[PDB]
Amino acid sequence: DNLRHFVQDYAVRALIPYIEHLVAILAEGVTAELQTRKLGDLYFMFGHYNLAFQSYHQAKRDFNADSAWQYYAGALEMAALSAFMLGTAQRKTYDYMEDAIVCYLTVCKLQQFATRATLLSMECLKTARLYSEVAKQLIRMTNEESDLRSALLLEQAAYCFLVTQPPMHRKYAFHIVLAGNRYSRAGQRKHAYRCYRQAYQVFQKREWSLAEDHIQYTVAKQAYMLKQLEEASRSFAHLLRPGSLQSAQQQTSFLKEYIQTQNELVKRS
């Protein structure tokens, strides 16, 4: 009840003395490189605005050496954090941030660094409306690092690529179903299912039933057991084998579609 916020306000305004103690501790610290980055990120928990820039600078200079570049990587992303409390944000620093991923990706194969580096890129460029860049570097990320992480990152990068402009859903659609397979493979069901649904809706928005027909044969395999049959039935019906140049397996497939629509007709009649 009220006691929580009472102790909360008192503890916050006693931590202001505590953060002052830590400021004294770091002013003592300036008098190792790991000590420097501990200094940085500790006062970044309450986020020093310019000491951000000086930690940025010092970390860059020294961690040119000491080729364990998590120091320097984390340094420039906390420089991006500074850019959040920096109106100019020296927007080329964002370019620096892009730099951050591509080289440091290769520096260490601990992919999580690449992940949240790209995520900070995502958010900060969303603070610039120019999502195109992070769209491209997220799509160049998502091919790799997994077949599962590849999938949810495929849709992340995908909808993000669509964040800048509504149309050109094309490669969006392609890789999001070519990852919806992996979604059915190793993903929590609600996210994979929202994959399938949003992908299919994006299909219908600008129809192009050619590859949608085979992905709707997949809709059917999840409809021959779980989903509704009529959607697959009408999907194959609009393909309409003669004049659509279907193939031997496709004719057999629409035989099976006749089987499913037979189930549907029998259940209706």
Residue numbers in the entry: 355 to 385, 424 to 661
The authors write:
However, in the regions of TRAPPC8 and TRAPPC11 located on either side of the core the local resolution was suitable for de novo model building. In the case of TRAPPC8, residues 350–660 form an α‐solenoid of thirteen α‐helices that includes the site of interaction with TRAPPC2. TRAPPC8 (yellow) is formed by thirteen α‐helices and binds TRAPPC2 via helices 9, 10 and 11. The less well‐resolved C‐terminal region (residues 660–1,319) forms the arm that connects to TRAPPC12 and TRAPPC13. This part of TRAPPC8 is not present in the yeast orthologue Trs85, consistent with it forming an armless complex. The interaction between TRAPPC2 and TRAPPC8 encloses a total surface area of ~550 Å with the TRAPPC2‐binding region of TRAPPC8 formed by α‐helices 9 and 11. Conserved regions in TRAPPC8 (Pro559‐His567 in α‐helix 9 and Trp600‐Ile607 in α‐helix 11) form a hydrophobic pocket needed for the interaction. In addition, α‐helix 9 contains several polar and charged residues, such as Arg562 and Lys563, that are likely to interact with key residues in TRAPPC2, including Asp46. Interestingly, Asp46 appears to be particularly critical for the assembly of TRAPP complexes as mutation of this residue causes spondyloepiphyseal dysplasia tarda in humans and disrupts the TRAPP complexes in yeast.
